[PDB]
Amino acid sequence: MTLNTVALELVPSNLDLGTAHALAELQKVRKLAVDAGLDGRIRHIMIPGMLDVLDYWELVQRELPDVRGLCTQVTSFLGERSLRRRLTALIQHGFEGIAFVGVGVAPTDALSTFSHLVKHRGVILIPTRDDELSRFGFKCKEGATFGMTQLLYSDAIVNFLTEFSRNTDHRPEILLSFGFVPKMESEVGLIDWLIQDPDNGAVATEQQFVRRLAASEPAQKRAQMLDLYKRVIDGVIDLGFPVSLHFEAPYGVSAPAFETFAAMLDYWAPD
């Protein structure tokens, strides 16, 4: 009924670099996972749609043997029969959960139509986004099984879920998203761009917290991020929602990223 999982996001490698490179990067991921002692603690790989998700997933299984598959599927460009063909192929090839996203079939319509084909049906949850209490409450009403959060760089998710758990009896599984921030974010600013909301403040707060983990040194950066992880976990796991974890490395998975992920799991891991 629930996934109760630790999901590592592996973005598919672009076709230009070739299949040998993609497999080489996957052997690196597998080996860095064993490095940090995560080689049994990560149960799922989350492969987002933009390689096709089915093609990368076959590569992933050849080098990451201990993992099952989650993915993202855009719905707004497929008819119901074509989308049913796509979701069926994804389930048949070993995907256990699908987040329905969109820019055709509307995502919230797919949440109800495919409730018996797809057992775990997700939406994106952005706790700081305006109007999210009703938007996320509508998506659950339409049949969302889990909410995968935007990258979390504050504790706004704590107040979001507490007020959500009081205004409705919906208890969807929450995939808490934590993203490692390398010093290289100082120059590229990819993570800062991903979470932007032009005039939010709460977001601005998150953005400030990101530029610091970047400017911080690896020892303290891990501690500052871990401080936020424990504040979120302590303010959430008792609320009645099934909680899972979504680990991201937007710049590419690295040994520092995995030791930060291992530190989070060492404090609390789902089950």
Side-chain angles (χ1 to χ4, degrees), residues 141-158:
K141 161 201 178 301
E142 295 294 84
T145 289
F146 67 94
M148 192 174 49
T149 76
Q150 167 75 284
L151 281 183
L152 300 178
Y153 290 112
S154 75
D155 67 342
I157 182 74
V158 173

PDB file of all heavy atoms in Angstrom, residues 141-158:
ATOM      1  N   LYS A 141      -7.712  14.314  -3.525  1.00  0.00           N
ATOM      2  CA  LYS A 141      -9.113  14.001  -3.795  1.00  0.00           C
ATOM      3  C   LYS A 141      -9.262  13.296  -5.133  1.00  0.00           C
ATOM      4  O   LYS A 141     -10.080  12.381  -5.275  1.00  0.00           O
ATOM      5  CB  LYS A 141      -9.944  15.285  -3.760  1.00  0.00           C
ATOM      6  CG  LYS A 141     -11.302  15.193  -4.446  1.00  0.00           C
ATOM      7  CD  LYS A 141     -11.836  16.572  -4.833  1.00  0.00           C
ATOM      8  CE  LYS A 141     -13.171  16.466  -5.576  1.00  0.00           C
ATOM      9  NZ  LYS A 141     -13.096  15.658  -6.839  1.00  0.00           N
ATOM     10  N   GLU A 142      -8.459  13.693  -6.121  1.00  0.00           N
ATOM     11  CA  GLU A 142      -8.484  13.071  -7.435  1.00  0.00           C
ATOM     12  C   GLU A 142      -7.781  11.717  -7.473  1.00  0.00           C
ATOM     13  O   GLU A 142      -7.895  11.010  -8.482  1.00  0.00           O
ATOM     14  CB  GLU A 142      -7.859  14.018  -8.461  1.00  0.00           C
ATOM     15  CG  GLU A 142      -8.643  15.310  -8.661  1.00  0.00           C
ATOM     16  CD  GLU A 142     -10.014  15.082  -9.291  1.00  0.00           C
ATOM     17  OE1 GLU A 142     -10.972  14.765  -8.550  1.00  0.00           O
ATOM     18  OE2 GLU A 142     -10.131  15.221 -10.530  1.00  0.00           O
ATOM     19  N   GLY A 143      -7.058  11.339  -6.416  1.00  0.00           N
ATOM     20  CA  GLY A 143      -6.475  10.011  -6.355  1.00  0.00           C
ATOM     21  C   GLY A 143      -4.968   9.903  -6.181  1.00  0.00           C
ATOM     22  O   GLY A 143      -4.412   8.814  -6.364  1.00  0.00           O
ATOM     23  N   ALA A 144      -4.291  10.990  -5.817  1.00  0.00           N
ATOM     24  CA  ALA A 144      -2.851  10.919  -5.582  1.00  0.00           C
ATOM     25  C   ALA A 144      -2.545  10.004  -4.401  1.00  0.00           C
ATOM     26  O   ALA A 144      -3.147  10.131  -3.331  1.00  0.00           O
ATOM     27  CB  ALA A 144      -2.273  12.313  -5.331  1.00  0.00           C
ATOM     28  N   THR A 145      -1.614   9.070  -4.609  1.00  0.00           N
ATOM     29  CA  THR A 145      -1.149   8.148  -3.576  1.00  0.00           C
ATOM     30  C   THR A 145       0.024   8.716  -2.778  1.00  0.00           C
ATOM     31  O   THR A 145       0.121   8.488  -1.565  1.00  0.00           O
ATOM     32  CB  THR A 145      -0.749   6.814  -4.219  1.00  0.00           C
ATOM     33  OG1 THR A 145      -1.926   6.127  -4.671  1.00  0.00           O
ATOM     34  CG2 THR A 145      -0.002   5.929  -3.242  1.00  0.00           C
ATOM     35  N   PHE A 146       0.924   9.452  -3.430  1.00  0.00           N
ATOM     36  CA  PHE A 146       2.062  10.032  -2.732  1.00  0.00           C
ATOM     37  C   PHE A 146       2.379  11.414  -3.280  1.00  0.00           C
ATOM     38  O   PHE A 146       2.078  11.736  -4.433  1.00  0.00           O
ATOM     39  CB  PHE A 146       3.314   9.132  -2.801  1.00  0.00           C
ATOM     40  CG  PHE A 146       3.918   8.988  -4.178  1.00  0.00           C
ATOM     41  CD1 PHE A 146       4.954   9.821  -4.591  1.00  0.00           C
ATOM     42  CD2 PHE A 146       3.489   7.987  -5.038  1.00  0.00           C
ATOM     43  CE1 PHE A 146       5.534   9.679  -5.845  1.00  0.00           C
ATOM     44  CE2 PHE A 146       4.063   7.834  -6.293  1.00  0.00           C
ATOM     45  CZ  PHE A 146       5.089   8.683  -6.697  1.00  0.00           C
ATOM     46  N   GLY A 147       2.968  12.237  -2.422  1.00  0.00           N
ATOM     47  CA  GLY A 147       3.482  13.528  -2.823  1.00  0.00           C
ATOM     48  C   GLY A 147       4.994  13.561  -2.766  1.00  0.00           C
ATOM     49  O   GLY A 147       5.591  13.320  -1.712  1.00  0.00           O
ATOM     50  N   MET A 148       5.646  13.874  -3.865  1.00  0.00           N
ATOM     51  CA  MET A 148       7.078  14.002  -3.897  1.00  0.00           C
ATOM     52  C   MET A 148       7.399  15.455  -3.798  1.00  0.00           C
ATOM     53  O   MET A 148       7.012  16.218  -4.621  1.00  0.00           O
ATOM     54  CB  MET A 148       7.651  13.409  -5.183  1.00  0.00           C
ATOM     55  CG  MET A 148       9.154  13.232  -5.230  1.00  0.00           C
ATOM     56  SD  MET A 148       9.864  12.410  -6.624  1.00  0.00           S
ATOM     57  CE  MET A 148       9.084  13.252  -7.928  1.00  0.00           C
ATOM     58  N   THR A 149       8.103  15.832  -2.760  1.00  0.00           N
ATOM     59  CA  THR A 149       8.299  17.240  -2.478  1.00  0.00           C
ATOM     60  C   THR A 149       9.383  17.826  -3.369  1.00  0.00           C
ATOM     61  O   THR A 149      10.295  17.131  -3.827  1.00  0.00           O
ATOM     62  CB  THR A 149       8.661  17.465  -1.009  1.00  0.00           C
ATOM     63  OG1 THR A 149      10.026  17.086  -0.781  1.00  0.00           O
ATOM     64  CG2 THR A 149       7.745  16.649  -0.097  1.00  0.00           C
ATOM     65  N   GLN A 150       9.256  19.122  -3.633  1.00  0.00           N
ATOM     66  CA  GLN A 150      10.385  19.887  -4.131  1.00  0.00           C
ATOM     67  C   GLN A 150      11.533  19.774  -3.128  1.00  0.00           C
ATOM     68  O   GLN A 150      11.330  19.435  -1.958  1.00  0.00           O
ATOM     69  CB  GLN A 150       9.963  21.345  -4.357  1.00  0.00           C
ATOM     70  CG  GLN A 150      11.079  22.360  -4.580  1.00  0.00           C
ATOM     71  CD  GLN A 150      11.703  22.268  -5.962  1.00  0.00           C
ATOM     72  OE1 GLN A 150      12.490  21.359  -6.249  1.00  0.00           O
ATOM     73  NE2 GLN A 150      11.365  23.222  -6.825  1.00  0.00           N
ATOM     74  N   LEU A 151      12.755  20.002  -3.612  1.00  0.00           N
ATOM     75  CA  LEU A 151      13.922  20.055  -2.738  1.00  0.00           C
ATOM     76  C   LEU A 151      13.621  20.897  -1.503  1.00  0.00           C
ATOM     77  O   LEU A 151      13.021  21.970  -1.600  1.00  0.00           O
ATOM     78  CB  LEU A 151      15.117  20.638  -3.497  1.00  0.00           C
ATOM     79  CG  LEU A 151      15.864  19.710  -4.459  1.00  0.00           C
ATOM     80  CD1 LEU A 151      17.075  20.418  -5.068  1.00  0.00           C
ATOM     81  CD2 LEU A 151      16.285  18.430  -3.754  1.00  0.00           C
ATOM     82  N   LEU A 152      14.015  20.394  -0.338  1.00  0.00           N
ATOM     83  CA  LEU A 152      13.688  21.026   0.938  1.00  0.00           C
ATOM     84  C   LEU A 152      14.938  21.701   1.497  1.00  0.00           C
ATOM     85  O   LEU A 152      15.916  21.030   1.839  1.00  0.00           O
ATOM     86  CB  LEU A 152      13.132  20.000   1.922  1.00  0.00           C
ATOM     87  CG  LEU A 152      11.860  19.262   1.494  1.00  0.00           C
ATOM     88  CD1 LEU A 152      11.463  18.246   2.546  1.00  0.00           C
ATOM     89  CD2 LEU A 152      10.719  20.241   1.236  1.00  0.00           C
ATOM     90  N   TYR A 153      14.901  23.033   1.590  1.00  0.00           N
ATOM     91  CA  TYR A 153      15.990  23.795   2.189  1.00  0.00           C
ATOM     92  C   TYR A 153      15.490  24.698   3.310  1.00  0.00           C
ATOM     93  O   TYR A 153      16.192  25.635   3.713  1.00  0.00           O
ATOM     94  CB  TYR A 153      16.737  24.590   1.117  1.00  0.00           C
ATOM     95  CG  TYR A 153      17.520  23.681   0.198  1.00  0.00           C
ATOM     96  CD1 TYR A 153      17.157  23.516  -1.135  1.00  0.00           C
ATOM     97  CD2 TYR A 153      18.610  22.963   0.673  1.00  0.00           C
ATOM     98  CE1 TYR A 153      17.870  22.672  -1.971  1.00  0.00           C
ATOM     99  CE2 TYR A 153      19.327  22.121  -0.151  1.00  0.00           C
ATOM    100  CZ  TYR A 153      18.954  21.979  -1.472  1.00  0.00           C
ATOM    101  OH  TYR A 153      19.670  21.138  -2.290  1.00  0.00           O
ATOM    102  N   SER A 154      14.287  24.426   3.812  1.00  0.00           N
ATOM    103  CA  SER A 154      13.748  25.013   5.030  1.00  0.00           C
ATOM    104  C   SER A 154      12.858  23.961   5.683  1.00  0.00           C
ATOM    105  O   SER A 154      12.817  22.807   5.246  1.00  0.00           O
ATOM    106  CB  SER A 154      12.986  26.309   4.731  1.00  0.00           C
ATOM    107  OG  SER A 154      11.726  26.029   4.142  1.00  0.00           O
ATOM    108  N   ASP A 155      12.137  24.356   6.733  1.00  0.00           N
ATOM    109  CA  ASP A 155      11.216  23.460   7.425  1.00  0.00           C
ATOM    110  C   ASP A 155       9.755  23.804   7.158  1.00  0.00           C
ATOM    111  O   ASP A 155       8.881  23.426   7.943  1.00  0.00           O
ATOM    112  CB  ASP A 155      11.493  23.466   8.929  1.00  0.00           C
ATOM    113  CG  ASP A 155      11.161  24.801   9.580  1.00  0.00           C
ATOM    114  OD1 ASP A 155      11.051  25.814   8.858  1.00  0.00           O
ATOM    115  OD2 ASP A 155      11.030  24.839  10.822  1.00  0.00           O
ATOM    116  N   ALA A 156       9.472  24.517   6.063  1.00  0.00           N
ATOM    117  CA  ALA A 156       8.090  24.864   5.745  1.00  0.00           C
ATOM    118  C   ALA A 156       7.212  23.627   5.600  1.00  0.00           C
ATOM    119  O   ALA A 156       5.998  23.700   5.828  1.00  0.00           O
ATOM    120  CB  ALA A 156       8.039  25.704   4.469  1.00  0.00           C
ATOM    121  N   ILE A 157       7.802  22.484   5.236  1.00  0.00           N
ATOM    122  CA  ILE A 157       7.021  21.256   5.084  1.00  0.00           C
ATOM    123  C   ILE A 157       6.397  20.841   6.411  1.00  0.00           C
ATOM    124  O   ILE A 157       5.336  20.203   6.435  1.00  0.00           O
ATOM    125  CB  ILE A 157       7.900  20.130   4.502  1.00  0.00           C
ATOM    126  CG1 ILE A 157       7.087  18.847   4.286  1.00  0.00           C
ATOM    127  CG2 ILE A 157       9.059  19.840   5.427  1.00  0.00           C
ATOM    128  CD1 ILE A 157       6.137  18.901   3.109  1.00  0.00           C
ATOM    129  N   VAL A 158       7.036  21.190   7.531  1.00  0.00           N
ATOM    130  CA  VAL A 158       6.489  20.837   8.838  1.00  0.00           C
ATOM    131  C   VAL A 158       5.139  21.513   9.042  1.00  0.00           C
ATOM    132  O   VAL A 158       4.135  20.855   9.335  1.00  0.00           O
ATOM    133  CB  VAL A 158       7.478  21.207   9.957  1.00  0.00           C
ATOM    134  CG1 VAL A 158       6.830  20.994  11.315  1.00  0.00           C
ATOM    135  CG2 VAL A 158       8.753  20.385   9.835  1.00  0.00           C
TER     136      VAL A 158
END
